[PDB]
């Protein structure tokens, strides 16, 4: 968690998602709904399954190799053959351990960043029409029906339409005393 969008301001995870990885949750006067962002999850899918593509498909065809098991004990050259084969295993053991360590850490940071930028992208769209609780939620001060919630969902929301209305509900509290 190098960005902070996972296990940071977000308390838990939404087990009720089957249509994507990252989604939204809203409640209006006309009802409550849920939907996921296809663009965000698709980007993280490419940068995760792509690592599988790099790992799988290596060409390392090897046919004839030195003997690695010995039924006898001869001396010097037998020791050298065992030492070479063992050294190759030891070097590749560290290569495998290092590779999985870097891939796992990068994957965790990649999904962490992919949702931190979704929060930033959404907040940029809403402008000063809303705010944040510090738990990932917003407060769209305009009287938003189902249409405008979905309009934000596929990245189309004219803030100037609800601009003067939201300012009343954010700054003009109790008629400024």
């Amino acid at each position: 968690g190098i960005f902070g969008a996972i296990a940071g301001f977000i308390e838990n995870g939404w087990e009720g998602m089957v249509d994507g990885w990252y989604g939204f949750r809203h409640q209006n006067s006309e009802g409550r709904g849920q939907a996921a962002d296809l663009k965000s999850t698709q980007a993280a899918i490419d940068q995760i399954s792509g690592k599988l593509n790099r790992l799988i498909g290596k060409t390392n065809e090897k046919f004839h190799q030195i003997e690695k098991e010995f039924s006898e004990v001869e001396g010097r050259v037998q020791d050298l053959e065992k030492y070479v084969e063992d050294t190759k295993i030891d070097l590749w053991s560290y290569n495998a351990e290092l590779l999985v360590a870097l891939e796992n850490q990068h994957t965790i940071d990649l999904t962490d960043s992919e949702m931190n930028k979704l929060f930033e992208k959404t907040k940029k769209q809403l402008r000063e029409n809303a705010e944040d609780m510090g738990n990932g939620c917003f407060k769209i001060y305009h009287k938003c029906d189902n249409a405008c919630i979905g309009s934000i969902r596929n990245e189309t929301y004219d803030h100037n339409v609800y601009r003067d209305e939201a300012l009343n509900n954010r700054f003009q509290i109790k008629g400024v005393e």
Binding site: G1, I6, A7, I10, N12, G13, W14, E15, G20, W21, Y22, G23, F24, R25, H26, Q27, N28, S29, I48, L52, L55, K58, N60, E61, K62, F63, H64, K68, E69, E85, I89, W92, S93, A96, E97, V100, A101, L102, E103, N104, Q105, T107, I108, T111, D112, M115, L118, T122, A130, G136, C137, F138, K139, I140, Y141, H142, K143, I149, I152, N169
Partner: protein, 323 residues
């Protein structure tokens, strides 16, 4: 919270009640919603004969077939991409040894071809096609099918001088031996010489072997041994065998080549699946990048690592609810 007023819009990430543990650069124990395994730790248990040709060693070993053992009589001019010799192999002919057994076995396996074309060597004043009582094919005395036990005729063993030019375009493989007699009385009986000597040479390399007379422990009711050498003749070269005595003459040459063939020691039964790797434990799936079933592999096998488990994180961190 919820209200009869402006809005609430939260964002989330999916999770599962039961995740998988993985290892990262900073956390030796961290939960991930989905992880995969990278190292193969299991085998089908059966060697598979596709696509690489696989020849079962049967009851004997490669060098036993290289000499003409009756137990290997079914290996007459057979090729293979992998010779799976078995641990239950037993020598069932005249006792023999190779001073460079490791080098000879690896060389023949690399060629992966037992093609044999006999050549009529010009032995004069000697008894050819010699047999022995320690190798009974069809209940009759015989010897190695690829070797020629020369024995003195009429108690006379004239000195030999033979040649064999190479006119082909590949490295011929002449395999010959020297007979070490158990007792001095034996040395006179078959060879009629106090002490023999052997010289096999070409234009590039020469060899010379003096038999070592001496009694040796009895195996298969034979106190003597035969030590088997080999020589390689390139195109444009010429072989020359001098052979004062005690020569187990060759019969032909083996067509040496280079390819993708090798040898392996295994006991898994032969099956009929399709696999790109063969290991002594058995054929393994070829999808995982690493494996730890066996260090000795043939084909396009994954790399061998000491670690038995390596989990790769595919999903994000699993942070459940409740509790």
């Amino acid at each position: 919270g919820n209200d009869n007023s402006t809005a609430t819009l939260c964002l989330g990430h999916h999770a599962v009640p039961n995740g998988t543990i993985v290892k990262t650069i900073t956390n030796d124990r961290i939960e991930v919603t989905n992880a995969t395994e990278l190292v193969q730790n299991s085998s089908i248990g059966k060697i598979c004969n596709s696509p690489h040709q696989i020849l079962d060693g049967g009851n004997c070993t490669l060098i036993d077939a290289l000499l003409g053992d009756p137990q290997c009589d079914g290996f007459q001019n057979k090729e293979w991409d992998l010779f799976v010799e078995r641990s239950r192999a037993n020598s069932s002919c005249y006792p023999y040894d190779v001073p460079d057994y490791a080098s000879l076995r690896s060389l023949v396996a690399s060629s992966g071809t037992l093609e044999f074309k006999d050549e009529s060597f010009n032995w004069t004043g000697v008894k050819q096609n010699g047999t022995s009582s320690a190798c009974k094919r069809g209940s009759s005395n015989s010897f190695f099918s690829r070797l020629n036990w020369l024995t003195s005729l009429n108690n006379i063993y004239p000195a030999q001088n033979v040649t064999m030019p190479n006119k082909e375009q590949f490295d011929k493989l002449y395999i010959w031996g020297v007979h070490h007699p158990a007792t001095d009385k034996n040395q006179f009986s078959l060879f009629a010489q106090s002490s023999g000597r052997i010289t096999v040479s070409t234009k590039r390399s020469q060899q010379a072997v003096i038999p070592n007379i001496g009694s040796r422990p009895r195996v298969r009711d034979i106190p003597s041994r035969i030590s088997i050498y080999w020589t390689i003749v390139k195109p444009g070269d010429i072989l020359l065998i001098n052979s004062t005595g005690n020569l187990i003459a060759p019969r032909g040459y083996f067509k040496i080549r280079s390819g993708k063939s090798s040898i392996m020691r295994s006991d898994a039964p032969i099956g009929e699946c399709k696999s790109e790797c063969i290991t002594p434990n058995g054929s393994i799936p070829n999808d995982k990048p690493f494996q730890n079933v066996n260090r000795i592999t043939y084909g396009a096998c994954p790399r061998y690592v000491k670690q038995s488990t390596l989990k790769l994180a595919t999903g994000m961190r699993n942070v459940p609810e409740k509790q």
